[PDB]
From Swiss-Prot:
Record's protein name: Glutamine--tRNA ligase
Keyword Protein biosynthesis: yes
Signal peptide start-end: none
A molecular function (GO) term: ATP binding
A GO cellular component entry from the record: cytosol
Encoding gene, per UniProt annotation: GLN4
Species this chain originates from: Saccharomyces cerevisiae (strain ATCC 204508 / S288c) (Baker's yeast)
Keywords noted in UniProt: Aminoacyl-tRNA synthetase, ATP-binding, Ligase, Nucleotide-binding, Phosphoprotein, Protein biosynthesis
One BP annotation, GO: glutaminyl-tRNA aminoacylation
UniProt keyword Ligase present: yes
Protein family: Belongs to the class-I aminoacyl-tRNA synthetase family.
Length: 186
């Protein structure tokens, strides 16, 4: 309810004081955050990751009532939904399906259990390079920022960790282009 109660709960779950002050600036998001936090186990121990993810969720709900919202919360606190991206997907799914939403349906549509390995990223990158080989041979290293943009956008890599994308691309491009030479001067 009141700013004092909201303040108390948020700092108790471990939001830092400067963060709490910012959150309560937005009363709709604060209302959702409060209600979302209250539908988790009394003895659950928040951390930087889940606090942030539940705040994401609150920022999506933004004062409105979402049927089956607890499915998303349980997914966050149990480690099923690890990223803002998964939380946004789970939110969109639960919003689309309303009360017909189930854990498995949400999971299945929020990348839950999907782990793309460095080896799979590499396969997808290789395939892209094969498909665009002559455009890439012609443009050489100047095109690397473009390859990166296109690789991020590959739907097979939606749930992949995007920090792997750049090093794997640099390695694969080297195989085709050879090392940077006079052709690559800027």
């Amino acid at each position: 309810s009141s700013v004092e109660e909201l303040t108390q709960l948020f700092s108790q779950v471990g939001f830092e004081d400067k963060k709490v002050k910012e959150i309560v600036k937005n009363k709709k998001v604060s209302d959702s955050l409060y209600k979302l936090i209250k539908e988790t186990p009394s003895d659950y121990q928040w951390n930087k990751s889940t606090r942030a993810l539940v705040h994401n969720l609150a920022s999506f709900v933004k004062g409105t009532d979402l049927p089956k919202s607890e499915l998303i919360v349980n997914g966050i606190i149990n480690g099923d939904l690890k990223t803002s991206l998964q939380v946004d997907a789970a939110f969109k799914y639960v919003k689309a399906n309303g009360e017909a939403s189930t854990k498995m349906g949400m999971n299945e549509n929020s990348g839950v259990g999907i782990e793309i390995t460095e080896d799979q990223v590499r396969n997808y990158v290789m395939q892209y390079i094969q498909e665009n080989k002559e455009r890439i041979l012609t443009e050489r290293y100047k095109l690397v920022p473009g390859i990166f943009a296109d690789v991020k956008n590959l739907k097979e890599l939606k749930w992949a960790d995007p920090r792997s994308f750049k090093p794997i691309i640099d390695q694969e491009v080297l195989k085709l282009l050879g090392p940077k030479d006079e052709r690559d001067l800027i």
